[PDB]
Amino acid sequence: HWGYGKHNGPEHWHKDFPIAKGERQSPVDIDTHTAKYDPSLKPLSVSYDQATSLRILNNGHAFNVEFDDSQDKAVLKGGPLDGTYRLIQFHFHWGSLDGQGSEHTVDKKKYAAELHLVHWNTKYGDFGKAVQQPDGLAVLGIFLKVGSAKPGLQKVVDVLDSIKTKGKSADFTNFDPRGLLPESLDYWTYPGSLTTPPLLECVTWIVLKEPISVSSEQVLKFRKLNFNGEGEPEELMVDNWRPAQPLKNRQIKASFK
Ligand SMILES: Cc1cc(C)nc(SCC(=O)c2ccc(S(N)(=O)=O)c(Cl)c2)n1
Ligand SMILES: [Zn+2]
Fold first, then answer.
1. Among protein residues, the one whose CA lies closest to atom 17 of ligand 1
2. Of 192, 197, 240, 246, which is least surrounded by CB within 10 A?
3. Which residue is closest in CA terms to ligand 1's atom 19?
4. How far, in Å, CA of 85 to CA of 136, rounded?
5. Which of 33, 61, 104, 119 is catalytic?
6. Which residues are 115's β-sheet partners?
7. Where on the chain is Phosphoserine found, per UniProt?
8. CA-based nearest residue to 142, from 172, 184, 100, 108
9. Contacts of 160 (CB under 8 A, 6+ apart)
């Protein structure tokens, strides 16, 4: 029943998923002045040289590029993490207009979109078990602003018209997620949750300070996708973001400055 409309959007999720109103929900506004620099935070280690993408799917909420996570091929470690986390998929959240789209905000500033590279803690053996643990996931978030094209995004952008509607999927091999990264790995980090239902409180959020730039034509191609399935009335897939949630009893730490 859940989605991003007036009748089934974020404001409604608590009825089906009461943890919507819980103690460590995401996303949040990052208040850059009150985030605490922590000199013991390690550099983030992103090892994506052996990444194996498999498929891309429109799930009716976003599109997901899914990876083979049956071996240690594409992993995240270091940073605030004390375990190895395997890349399972990435997806984006974006807006109807360039002035909104991101889930995390920075001093209340919204970005055009937000990339989530979803990773799960290998001590829990698989993604389904990890999500049931307070330290089960590590999600690397990267802001997108509109300006110059991101060449590493283009192969993603070019396949979207093959997965226009809910439930469509396409083969998507040999995609290199290193082409979606900014120069700097400086980050903010805090304990939070999935930002869609089931909203499980199982995520260590790692949000990069440096946005990537995408072109107006790249982000336009995102807004051409559909929430509906093939042969149903067209609802453009836009504004598939959850707003900032109360920080409550949490401190956001910074790896820098
Ligand atoms: C195999 C698989 C992978 C993923 C990421 N989600 C699912 S079900 C949806 C889900 O659990 C999920 C949705 C959204 C997010 S987010 N927006 O990055 O916080 C995450 Cl981490 C998980 N299933
Ligand atoms: Zn997400």
1. 195
2. 246
3. 194
4. 9
5. 61
6. 92, 142
7. 162, 169
8. 184
9. 63, 221, 222, 224, 225
Tokens of 64: 């997901």
Q: Ligand 1 pocket, 139 CB below 6 A?
A: yes
Give the domains, in start order, of the chain with CATH numbers. Answer: 1-257 (3.10.200.10)
For ligand 1, pick from 54, 68, 194, 205 the residue to mutate: most ligand atoms within 8 Å of CB.
Answer: 194
Query: Tokens at residue 123, please?
Result: 């001590």
Residues lining ion ligand 2 (Cβ < 5 A) are: 116
* C-alpha to C-alpha distance for 80 and 82, rounded to whole angstroms: 7
Q: Would residue 61 show up in a list of annotated catalytic residues for this protein?
A: yes
- CA dihedral defined by 186, 112, 23, 249, rounded to 10 degrees? 50
> Is 91 annotated as belonging to a binding site?
yes
* Tokens matching residue 193: 């949750």
Give the pairing of strands 29-30 and 105-106.
parallel
Dihedral sign of CA atoms 157, 158, 159, 164 in order? positive
Is the Cβ–Cβ distance between 170 and 161 less than 8 Å?
A: no
Cβ-based neighbours of 249, under 8 Å, separated by 6 or more: 23
User: Is 93 labeled as ligand-binding?
Assistant: yes
- Contacts with 1 (C-beta within 8 Å, 6 or more apart), sequence order: 8, 16
Tell me the C-alpha distance between 210 and 197, whole Å.
28
Q: Judging by beta carbons within 10 Å of its beta carbon (0-12, 13-18, 19+), is residue 132 exposed, middle or buried?
A: exposed
Atom of ligand 1 nearest to the CA of 103: 17
Determine whether the annotation assigns residue 116 to a binding site: yes
